[PDB]
Amino acid sequence: QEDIIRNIARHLAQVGDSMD
Amino acid sequence: QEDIIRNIARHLAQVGDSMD
Amino acid sequence: GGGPTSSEQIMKTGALLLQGFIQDRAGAPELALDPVPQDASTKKLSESLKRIGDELDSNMELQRMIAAVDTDSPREVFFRVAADMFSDGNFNWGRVVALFYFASKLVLKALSTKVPELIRTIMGWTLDFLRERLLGWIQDQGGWDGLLSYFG
Amino acid sequence: GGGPTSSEQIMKTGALLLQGFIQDRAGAPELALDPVPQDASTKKLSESLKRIGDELDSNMELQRMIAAVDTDSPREVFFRVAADMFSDGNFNWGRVVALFYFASKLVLKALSTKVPELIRTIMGWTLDFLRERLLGWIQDQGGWDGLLSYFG
């Protein structure tokens, strides 16, 4: 689970960064 | 969870019964 | 009364945007949510948020990843994701927006577990009443096959 | 040496059918499973099982229901389902077949958790070796952007 959560965060961070 | 498990069993029992 | 830069205004507008955003993604008249009051500028912001929410909903791989987390303890999940999202010490509006989006998905995931338990609770009452008050009559009908007959 | 009705033969043939069935549904040369030895009659049985396995795989609602169980403790899950399936005291071959099918799905669900942890374990070794033995050289390249250059 702890790795699934990490994966989501980093995809969200990436989505967020790619919005610029 | 305990209800999810019950649901699967009863669908399996039903599949099994409907095989006849 | 501070302007846009005051923390007062930031928290106030933040709560309005967030709530409007999560409600819009949560949408049976019984389940109708009251609109958040918004001036023009906050309205434009909410529109933007809703469009981005819709594009993010289209990424199936993100949806798969979100649905795979166990939200047995959603608060723990929320703060882990948030911490991780901003761990590198960088900020941008995209990340804030994506965080709001994750909060709205957590509402829907929580509901996915709350609704069956709500159903179970009310079934408990109903079947308990049925067993003690109606079962004798239902037996006289020969059980639920009687209702088959009744409906033809 | 008992015939078909002896428990010896029932357990022996049962293990052969079950294993052949689960292996067939588990199918990269490294992941090739050795065939179970079967006389003609056991072979016909396995064919039948495999066809039923394929039809059951097509019921998307069953697949959704199976994937929703938490197999944190798969043994507990297995015995609960089995007990429930036969709780009414009835038996038929369909139910036995559907039980075999559920066992094969549990293998695949267990693998779904085992494989990422296997990957994590080997990454642990690899990154540990990388950190202590290769990092200095990789730094001299300016990190992984060096590999970008190398690949052009």
Q: Out of A8, A15, A20, whose CB is closest to C81?
A: A8
* Chain D nearest C-alpha distance from B12 (Å): 6
Residue C102 burial class via C-beta count within 10 angstroms: exposed 0-12, middle 13-18, buried 19 and up: buried
Q: In the structure, do chain A and chain B come into contact, i.e. share 3 or more CB pairs under 8 Å? A: no
**Contact flag B20-D94 (C-beta cutoff 8 Å):** yes
Helices (H), chain D: 7-24, 40-58, 60-68, 74-85, 93-129, 135-140, 145-151
DSSP element (H, E) containing A18: helix A2-18
Contact criterion met (CB < 8 Å) for B12 and D81: yes
Domain ranges within chain C, ordered by starting residue: 1-152
Which residues of chain B lie closer than 8 angstroms to D84, CB-CB? 5-6, 9-10, 13
C-alpha A17/C-alpha C93 separation (Å) is 8
Cβ contact B17–D52 (<8 Å) = no
Tokens at D106, concatenated: 């549990």
The string of DSSP letters for chain C reads ---TTSHHHHHHHHHHHHHHHHHHTT--GGGPPPPPP--HHHHHHHHHHHHHHHHHHH-HHHHHHHHHS--SSHHHHHHHHHHHHTTTS---HHHHHHHHHHHHHHHHHHHHHHHHHHHHHHHHHHHHHIIIIIHHHHHHTTTTHHHHHHH-
Report resolution in angstroms.
Answer: 2.2
CATH topology of domain C1-152: Apoptosis Regulator Bcl-x (1.10.437)
Q: For B20, which of D68, D77, D92 is closest by C-beta distance?
A: D92
Distance of alpha carbon C144 from alpha carbon D43, whole angstroms: 44
Q: Is A3 on the interface with C (CB under 8 A)?
A: no
- Is B3 in the D-facing interface, judged by CB distances under 8 Å? no
Residue D63: CB atoms within 10 A of its CB come to 13
Whole-angstrom distance, CA of residue D66 vs CA of residue B11: 10
Which residue of chain A is at minimal alpha-carbon distance from C77?
A: A5
Beta carbons of A12 and C69 less than 8 Å apart? no
